[PDB]
Amino acid sequence: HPTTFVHLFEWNWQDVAQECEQYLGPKGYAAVQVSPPNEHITGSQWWTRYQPVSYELQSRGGNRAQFIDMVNRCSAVGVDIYVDTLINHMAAGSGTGTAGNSFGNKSFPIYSPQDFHESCTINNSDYGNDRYRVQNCELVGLADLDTASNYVQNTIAAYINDLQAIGVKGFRFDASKHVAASDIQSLMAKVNGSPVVFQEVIDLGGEAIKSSEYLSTGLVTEFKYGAKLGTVFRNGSLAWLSNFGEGWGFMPSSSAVVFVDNHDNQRGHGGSSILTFEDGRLYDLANVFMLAYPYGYPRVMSSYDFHGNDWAGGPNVPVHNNGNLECFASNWKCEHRWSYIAGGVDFRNNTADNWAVTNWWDNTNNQISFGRGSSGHMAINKEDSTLTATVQTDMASGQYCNVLKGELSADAKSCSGEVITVNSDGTINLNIGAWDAMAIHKNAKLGA
Ligand SMILES: C[C@H]1O[C@H](O[C@H]2[C@H](O)[C@@H](O)[C@@H](O)O[C@@H]2CO)[C@H](O)[C@@H](O)[C@@H]1N[C@H]1C=C(CO)[C@@H](O[C@H]2O[C@H](CO)[C@@H](O[C@H]3O[C@H](CO)[C@@H](O)[C@H](O)[C@H]3O)[C@H](O)[C@H]2O)[C@H](O)[C@H]1O
Ligand SMILES: C[C@H]1O[C@H](O[C@H]2[C@H](O)[C@@H](O)[C@@H](O[C@H]3[C@H](O)[C@@H](O)[C@@H](O)O[C@@H]3CO)O[C@@H]2CO)[C@H](O)[C@@H](O)[C@@H]1N[C@H]1C=C(CO)[C@@H](O)[C@H](O)[C@H]1O
Ligand SMILES: C[C@H]1O[C@H](O[C@H]2[C@H](O)[C@@H](O)[C@@H](O[C@H]3[C@H](O)[C@@H](O)[C@@H](O)O[C@@H]3CO)O[C@@H]2CO)[C@H](O)[C@@H](O)[C@@H]1N[C@H]1C=C(CO)[C@@H](O)[C@H](O)[C@H]1O
Ligand SMILES: C[C@H]1O[C@H](O[C@H]2[C@H](O)[C@@H](O)CO[C@@H]2CO)[C@H](O)[C@@H](O)[C@@H]1N[C@H]1C=C(CO)[C@@H](O)[C@H](O)[C@H]1O
Ligand SMILES: [Ca+2]
Ligand SMILES: [Cl-]
Ligand SMILES: [Cl-]
């Protein structure tokens, strides 16, 4: 049933907790990826979170008690917390952290200069041909930890195990490409149990380091997914997506974390083809495809309008602002609450017993429909005409809520939005307006 997580980028711990109770739990999201909760450098830019100072849980998102409160309140409604984990480095330079600690010259509350690789600079060419420099030199001046050192592994493992002890269920290993896979292996041997671990490795091909090196240590970000999906949605034909996945050169589905955009590449950090909230309904549709299609573990992005400043932090108005939700406009965008996206999550959540593509249909261009066997069916019309084809499904005949537009009542007698009819012979007579879609599934069926 739970199948999809969401990055609540720069949401603080109280907003996450309330969001779990009021929306993510009820709508079936599996987990929240939170911004780094450990002590980091002072400053309001979002990227301060990626400059650690210590592993005390005092950060822009809140203090340790507030962190625990969020973990608990989210867990109470069935939503896990995944922590963005800085395994590669500490802050650059000298300064002060969010818990009051000072640092400088590769000296921190828990590290000294010997705990780091010798200073050198990762240069653009190194990605293509110097594995050693990519993993032992400094990413944009950040102090590169000696991740082969037993002390460093133990210290990072203690941070991970502290977070597990208080209830955290997964971890994003930031900048995993900059850490030898064998160092990550040694780290994981000190990590208690088997939490969810996904490793951030950007590999579109042609580099010294390969995302495939990381398959044995956890899940891996498949950045090919969003890159190719955005190119297809912008310039290509949806019909080509019938074998999306391993046939496009992607890693195995059971290893991949997939997403349309992430916090870096919606700003042009870490792809002019990447779709983001800025693309409106094109983003809706791309998310509907992602969430209906049986490849990967999807992460929905949840952003703020940064008003053209790719460095700015988030709005200084909370999401839950004394009874008003600061979503959808020029503060928080709340893509995870957009109807087509949350509906796609419901569809994925209820078609997970059938990880196949069935009865693929298309018009050779930008209209597609397919099924998850008898568990669900979907269609996307990304053209300017109305889509009225008759398509074959394996669905039981009857009437179904279009979960992109509404939901089934508690009594199961009605839908709050459009109702789709599956005929006696299992067909559907589509009637999909331009740039619209539909999705139905067996657990959103009107019941006699
Ligand atoms: C941002 C990503 O950079 C690399 O990606 C490279 C790909 O690997 C390569 O294939 C090709 O596409 O190029 C890109 C390089 O542009 C890393 O591999 C990838 O891991 C990284 N993403 C994640 C990790 C980091 C680091 O913690 C995050 O970086 C953000 O935070 C840093 C540090 O604050 C910020 O840098 C700022 O500080 C420096 C000085 O320290 C100054 O130059 C300036 O003030 C700031 O830019 C980065 O801007 C920011 O991207 C990233 O968010 C993670 O997702
Ligand atoms: C929820 C789950 O979704 C995804 O898992 C699906 C795989 O991607 C599919 O490939 C398929 O896996 C089958 C393998 O293909 C096959 O080789 C064999 O190993 O059997 C597998 C199981 O049938 O179906 C999987 C769904 O069953 C995604 O890849 C996976 O990561 C997702 N699970 C995550 C989410 C939750 C949230 O609670 C956690 O419990 C899991 O630990 C996460 O990994
Ligand atoms: C928040 C909202 O985002 C989305 O819609 C964007 C559209 O995709 C863009 O096309 C554009 O809409 C313009 C229309 O195209 C145009 O016809 C005219 O009506 O002006 C519109 C606004 O300028 O901009 C939209 C964002 O401003 C996304 O598709 C949509 O689903 C999102 N709506 C959510 C928000 C509300 C508000 O509570 C909810 O009621 C909906 O259920 C959510 O889906
Ligand atoms: C606790 C220190 O451990 C490590 O030092 C080892 C080093 O690995 C080898 O020389 C073997 O012996 C020394 C002494 O144990 C770390 O390399 C060193 O950085 C550690 N000190 C840091 C940690 C603490 C507290 O966690 C601080 O008190 C200290 O200031 C800080 O530098
Ligand atoms: Ca490194
Ligand atoms: Cl702490
Ligand atoms: Cl990522």
Numbering used by the authors: 1 to 270, 273 to 450
Quote what the paper states about this structure.
The α-amylase from the psychrophilic bacterium Pseudoalteromonas haloplanktis (AHA) is probably the most thoroughly studied cold-adapted enzyme that shows such an anomalous T-optimum, which, in this case, is about 15°C lower than the melting temperature (Tm). Earlier computer simulations of the catalytic reactions of AHA and PPA, based on molecular dynamics (MD) free energy calculations using the empirical valence bond (EVB) method, could directly reproduce the T-optimum of AHA and explain its origin. It was found that a particular binding interaction, between Asp264 of the enzyme and the 2′- and 3′-hydroxyl groups at the −1 position of the oligosaccharide substrate, starts to break precisely at room temperature. Since only the cold-adapted AHA enzyme showed instability of the Asp264-substrate interaction above room temperature, we hypothesized that if its β7-α7 loop conformation could be brought to that found in PPA, then its T-optimum could possibly be raised. In particular, the final model (Chimera 4) that combines 16 mutations in all of the four identified regions above is predicted to almost entirely recover the stable hydrogen bond interaction between Asp264 and the substrate at 25°C, as opposed to the wild-type (WT) enzyme.
To structurally evaluate our computational design, we determined the crystal structures of Chimera 4 in its apo form and in complex with the inhibitor acarbose. The inhibitor is known to be rearranged by α-amylases in crystal soaking experiments to form several different products. The variant observed in the active site here was a pseudo-pentasaccharide which has also been observed in human PPA. As can be seen in Fig. 5A, the mutated side chains in Chimera 4 are all very close to their position in the corresponding complex with mesophilic PPA. The only exception is the NDW motif (residues 311 to 313) where the side-chain conformations differ somewhat. It appears that the extended β2-α2 and β8-α8 loops in PPA that pack against this motif are responsible for these differences, as Chimera 4 retains the shorter loops from AHA. The electron density is weak for the two residues Ala271 and Gly272 of the remodeled β7-α7 loop, in both the apo- and holo-structures, so that their backbone conformation cannot be confidently built. There is, however, clear indication from the partial density that the loop conformation is closer to that of PPA than AHA, as intended for Chimera 4. The mobility of the β7-α7 loop in the Chimera 4 complex with acarbose, as well as in PPA, is considerably less flexible than in AHA.
